[PDB]
Amino acid sequence: LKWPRDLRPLAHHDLLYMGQISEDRGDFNATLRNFLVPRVVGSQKHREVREFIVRSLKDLDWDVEEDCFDGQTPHGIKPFCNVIATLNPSACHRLVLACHYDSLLHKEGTFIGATDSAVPCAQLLYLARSLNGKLQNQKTRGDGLTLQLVFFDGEEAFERWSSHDSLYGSRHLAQKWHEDRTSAERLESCLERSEIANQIDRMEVMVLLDLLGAENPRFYSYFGETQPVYRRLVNIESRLNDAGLMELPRRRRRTNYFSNSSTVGFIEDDHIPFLKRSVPIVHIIPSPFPDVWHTLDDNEQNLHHPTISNLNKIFKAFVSEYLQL
Ligand SMILES: [Cu+2]
Ligand SMILES: [Cu+2]
Ligand SMILES: [Cu+2]
Ligand SMILES: [Cu+2]
Numbered sequence: 001l002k003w004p005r006d007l008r009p010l011a012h013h014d015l016l017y018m019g020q021i022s023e024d025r026g027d028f029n030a031t032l033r034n035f036l037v038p039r040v041v042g043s044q045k046h047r048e049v050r051e052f053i054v055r056s057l058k059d060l061d062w063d064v065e066e067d068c069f070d071g072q073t074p075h076g077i078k079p080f081c082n083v084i085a086t087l088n089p090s091a092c093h094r095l096v097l098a099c100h101y102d103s104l105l106h107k108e109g110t111f112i113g114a115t116d117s118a119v120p121c122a123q124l125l126y127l128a129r130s131l132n133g134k135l136q137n138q139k140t141r142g143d144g145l146t147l148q149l150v151f152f153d154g155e156e157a158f159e160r161w162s163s164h165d166s167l168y169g170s171r172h173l174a175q176k177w178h179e180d181r182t183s184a185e186r187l188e189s190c191l192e193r194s195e196i197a198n199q200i201d202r203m204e205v206m207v208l209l210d211l212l213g214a215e216n217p218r219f220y221s222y223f224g225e226t227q228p229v230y231r232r233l234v235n236i237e238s239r240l241n242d243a244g245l246m247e248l249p250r251r252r253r254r255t256n257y258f259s260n261s262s263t264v265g266f267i268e269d270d271h272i273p274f275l276k277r278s279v280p281i282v283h284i285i286p287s288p289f290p291d292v293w294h295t296l297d298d299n300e301q302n303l304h305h306p307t308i309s310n311l312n313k314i315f316k317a318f319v320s321e322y323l324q325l
Pocket of ligand 3 (some may be wrong): 104116156295
């Protein structure tokens with residue numbers, strides 16, 4: 001069973017371009033420093049991190065919705081706002097990139113969550129800005145595909161996960177889109193034999209980024225359904241290296257972030273408001289988790305700037321290939 005949208009391999013020139021950062025460096029770091037703050041649900045810093053996401057994307061002429069909602073926590077009802085930015089709201093199908101912008105409320109002290117998920121958030125804003133010229137151009141093709149970015153709120157648990165206790169942003173959004181009904185008829189250029197009953201069916205694939213920014217991550221294909229998309233990330237990282245475009249510690253080394261292994265079978269319970277609704281998922285999360293995971297050392301000084309820049313190359317080339325930029 002084939003992926004519904006045919007592949008067009010990234011043009012060599014684009015590969016070469018996506019691959020050489022050319023300060024960009026400063027744009028990315030400046031964007032990241034906005035996220036290197038505690039991002040606790042309901043706090044003022046949190047709210048301002050939202051306002052920053054919202055402004056940045058509006059500044060690029062994207063449509064931006066704040067899906068703001070209350071949810072029952074174990075610390076009383078709390079307010080939450082997801083941010084959905086869609087490049088071309090009319091386009092039937094969406095390549096969706098997502099991450100959460102809340103930081104874990106940490107029993108021990110101030111938790112910055114540099115990898116979890118400040119870097120992912122920054123990488124999303126950074127992708128949007130950096131590919132803006134090609135993205136604004138692709139938007140008017142009328143081809144029925146667009147890019148969409150979801151910054152979820154309230155994903156991080158408060159307790160020892162009672163199945164009632166986390167994923168506030170994803171449970172809410174997933175439901176909202178599952179219940180908001182539509183059809184190929186009301187949308188722009190759906191694929192020929194696609195079945196659209198509701199907004200969630202418009203998520204063509206959801207690419208979720210987590211726990212990025214530590215040195216030498218290892219990823220695997222966590223879903224057989226997305227295995228054709230996952231392979232594009234493998235192939236892109238391979239071309240980048242071939243072309244000598246990765247930053248390595250020494251000459252004649254290669255990055256091997258994206259394992260070509262057969263699909264693994266890990267517990268995938270936290271995507272699930274999405275999986276029960278059949279949204280295909282690529283989870284870009286390392287296995288094993290970074291050593292800093294949920295420690296107060298998940299900070300700015302523990303980020304591996306060369307890994308981060310290499311990943312940024314992979315993500316830009318990947319977006320570019322998928323949208324045929
Ligand atoms: Cu080009
Ligand atoms: Cu997280
Ligand atoms: Cu976490
Ligand atoms: Cu996963």
